């Protein structure tokens, strides 16, 4: 009743939890399928009600005993399934008498013993499954009773070795599976007399050397060994398998494959050798003209024969990824070649004929070579090439002739490729990677639509340097006011009046530092004025040249000198308000200047921290820094500001000189307030950019870096009353 009879009286009773053979079924049924039931044992004459049974499935029950007089009289049985049961051995006595059986499954039974008289009377058996049993050795004598077998699998068993004449009587075997046995040795005649064999699997065994038994297989077509310990493949290994088609030889430590190993193989399709380090000559592939994909990645190939092309007429894929290749013979012919990967070699040039013809060449890859020149029309003859990956080479000039059809171009390396690409040549190019973002800038990115890996990001300006006219005008104003007022303050202080107290000396020195900051801003704005709308051409050499280095040095020197002079002024004011000192203060100022100079020259010779932006300032560090200079400068400046603030507040708590006190207080407040945003934006790229724009970062840095330099002299001139009187008296002196 639980059975679900089909149209052609095919009883299907699976998963019903039965404990015995179903009863009350049609005696004329063909296929019986009791798979997931709990049939522990088969009693005697359990199938007496199914004389015409044709296919019996018992896959899944905890079957552990089959009576000898069970499944008897089933002379029409053809398929028997006993895979996932718990049989500890092949049922030698139970299985006999099935003279019409054509397929037997014994996959998952924990079989460890095979009786010597098993498989008796199976005259026309054609498929055998012994996958997951725990067999120790091949049952040679039991297999001697199956001369009509056509498919044998012993995949997951535990077989140590195959003795001589193991399968001598299997004259009609076709498929042999020995996937995951721990085979370590094969005798010379184990596969003797095993004609008609077409598929041989030895994937995950532990073969030491290359077996010779395959020399006795005259009809082999597919051969596998995936995870053996094979190290050397002697020449002439495959001379006994003229019909061999696929050879699976990977993931094993190959060392030396000889020269003529893959020789005179007519129907071989793909050859893939990786890791054969000791190989130093190209394989003698004469006679193998039907090859379709050839890869020799890891070896020591020194040259490519000129006869590689004009033979293997299909050759849809060529790969040589780790070789000592220096010369590239012309690939004249071989029109079906689609992909070429010649990377990590010693190629030093590409000649005009090197890729002559090459119809349907889609992908070309030379990503690591010592290439320093490319012929003008080296790519003229190319067809529908969609990928040309030429990176990490010593390129100086990249020809573009015959490259209109390119779909993706890579030039990640080639730091010497200062030339700017012409976007006219590449019409339908979609993705491009270039050594510098200024090359991409000519392609109208971020606006037919082309993607670039190095983004301009408004930090390497494709347009004018400063950007908005508001920023340009305010930076010009900052430069003008800083330069003029610092010059005026210096002329008033150091020239006319002979009074030289420590406070006046520090004021003059900080005005000098602000003057240097102003002249840095002035050269920056002069560069921007010169490069109006065409900043890409100027910036392609500004960062590389010494102008960026000298401007960055001036900026960092000015900033550090100003900070150090402010700190020294705070210390001097503290000492003066506490209650000869000229010499020590002067030498301290000299030490501060030398420290600023060495801090400025540190990135000039060390690590090349400049050239990160046209602003040539390592402090904003728009790109991710090495945290060797930026963080050190940030912490040093923060510590100096904290010390100055603590000193100022201590002296204010403790308390003519009030004018100097308030002047220094205003100076400290202005410098700290205007330095805070620069320090904030210094580490902004390092942290996740939650609504953080590189454009606004550049804007803030550009507007706030010279602001203290533009602001200090104005405050000094306008506010200090006694120093204004000094200005008046010195003006009278110079007029007189």
């Amino acid at each position: 009743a639980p059975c679900s009879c089909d149209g052609d009286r095919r009883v299907d009773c699976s998963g019903k939890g039965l404990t015995a053979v179903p009863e009350g079924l049609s005696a004329f049924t063909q296929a019986l399928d009791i798979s997931m039931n709990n049939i522990t044992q088969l009693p005697e004459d359990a199938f007496a009600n199914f004389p015409f049974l044709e296919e019996l499935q018992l896959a899944g029950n905890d079957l552990s005993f089959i009576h000898p007089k069970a499944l008897s009289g089933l002379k029409e049985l053809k398929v028997l399934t006993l895979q996932n049961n718990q049989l500890k051995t092949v049922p030698s006595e139970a299985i006999r008498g099935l003279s019409a059986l054509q397929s037997l499954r014994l996959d998952a039974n924990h079989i460890t013993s095979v009786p010597e008289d098993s498989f008796e009377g199976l005259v026309q058996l054609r498929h055998l499954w012994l996958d997951d049993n725990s067999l120790t050795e091949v049952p040679v004598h039991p297999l001697s009773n199956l001369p009509t077998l056509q498919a044998l699998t012993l995949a997951l068993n535990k077989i140590s070795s195959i003795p001589d004449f193991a399968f001598t009587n299997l004259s009609s075997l076709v498929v042999l599976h020995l996937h995951n046995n721990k085979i370590r040795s094969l005798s010379q005649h184990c596969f003797d007399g095993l004609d008609n064999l077409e598929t041989l699997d030895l994937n995950y065994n532990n073969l030491g050397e290359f077996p010779q038994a395959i020399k006795a297989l005259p009809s082999l077509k597919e051969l596998g060994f995936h995870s053996n310990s094979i190290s050397v493949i002697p020449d002439g290994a495959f001379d006994g398998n003229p019909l061999l088609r696929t050879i699976h030889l990977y993931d094993n430590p190959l060392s030396f494959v000889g020269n003529s190993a893959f020789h005179n193989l007519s129907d071989l399709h793909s050859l893939v050798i990786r890791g054969a380090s000791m190989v130093q000559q190209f394989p003698n592939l004469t006679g193998t003209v039907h090859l379709e994909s050839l890869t020799l990645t890891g070896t020591k190939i020194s040259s490519i024969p000129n006869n590689l092309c004009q033979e293997q007429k299909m050759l849809r894929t060529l790969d040589l990824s780790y070789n000592n290749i220096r010369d590239l013979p012309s690939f004249n012919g071989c029109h079906a070649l689609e992909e070429i990967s010649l990377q990590r070699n010693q190629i030093y040039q590409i000649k005009e004929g090197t890729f002559q013809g090459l119809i349907s060449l889609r992908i070309l890859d030379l990503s690591r070579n010592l290439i320093h020149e490319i012929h003008s029309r080296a790519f003229a003859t190319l067809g529908p090439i969609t990928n040309l990956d030429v990176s990490f080479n010593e390129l100086t000039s990249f020809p573009t002739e015959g490259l209109n059809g390119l779909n993706q171009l890579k030039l990640v390396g080639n730091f010497k490729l200062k030339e700017a690409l012409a976007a006219k040549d590449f019409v339908n190019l979609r993705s491009l990677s270039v050594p510098y973002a200024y090359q991409c800038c000519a392609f109208w990115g971020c606006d037919i639509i082309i993607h670039c890996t190095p983004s301009t990001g408004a930090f390497k300006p494709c347009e004018y340097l400063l950007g908005s006219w508001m920023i340009r005008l305010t930076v010009w104003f900052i430069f003008l006011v800083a330069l003029f007022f610092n010059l005026l303050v210096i002329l008033t202080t150091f020239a006319s009046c002979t009074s030289l107290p420590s406070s006046k000396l520090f004021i003059g020195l900080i005005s000098v530092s602000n003057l240097f900051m102003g002249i840095y801003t002035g050269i920056l704005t002069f560069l921007d004025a010169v490069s109006w709308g065409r900043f890409a051409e100027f910036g392609i050499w500004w960062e590389t040249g010494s102008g960026c280095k000298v401007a960055g040095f001036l900026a960092v020197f000015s900033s550090e000198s100003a900070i150090f002079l402010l700190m020294l002024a705070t210390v001097e004011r503290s000492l003066s308000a506490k209650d000869n000192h000229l010499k020590q203060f002067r030498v301290a100022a000299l030490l501060a200047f030398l420290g600023a100079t060495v801090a400025g020259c540190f990135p000039l010779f060390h690590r090349g921290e400049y050239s990160a932006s046209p602003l040539c300032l390592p402090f904003p560090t728009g790109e991710t820094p090495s945290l060797g200079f930026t963080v050190t400068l940030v912490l040093l400046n923060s510590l100096a500001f904290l010390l100055m603030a603590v000193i100022y507040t201590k002296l204010y708590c403790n308390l003519s000189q009030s004018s100097m006190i308030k002047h220094v207080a205003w100076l400290i407040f202005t410098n700290c307030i205007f330095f805070c945003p620069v320090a904030f934006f210094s580490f902004a790229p390092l942290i996740t950019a939650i609504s953080i724009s590189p454009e606004i970062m550049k804007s803030v840095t550009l507007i706030f870096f010279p602001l203290p330099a533009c602001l200090n002299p104005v405050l000094y001139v306008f506010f200090n009353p006694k120093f204004k009187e000094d200005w008046k008296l010195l003006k009278r002196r110079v007029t007189k």
Partner: nanobody
Framework: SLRLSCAAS????????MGWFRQAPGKAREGVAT???????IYADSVKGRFTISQDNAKNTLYLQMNSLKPEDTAMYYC???????????????????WGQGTQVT
Amino acid sequence: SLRLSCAASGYTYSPYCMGWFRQAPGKAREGVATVDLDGSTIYADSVKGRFTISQDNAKNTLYLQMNSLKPEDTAMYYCASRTRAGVTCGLNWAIFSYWGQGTQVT
């Protein structure tokens, strides 16, 4: 302590590789003691020493004498035999052709 006697009805010549098997409910039939044509005897290791098996070819009957029984040996016992060309020892249930009715021992 007790003795199980097995009698064979069919008789052509000296039967080959007699044996005794034990089955706990809901599992396989393991072998406990077996003999062969020339009288060599193979015992199960877990039952080695205690049980003894003797065949009488005059009446072609098996006898299994069991002593010092333990509660885990409670199971159903069967008497199995074959006739032809058996080289493997009798501990394997597949090689046997004739199986007895089997009794229950507790």
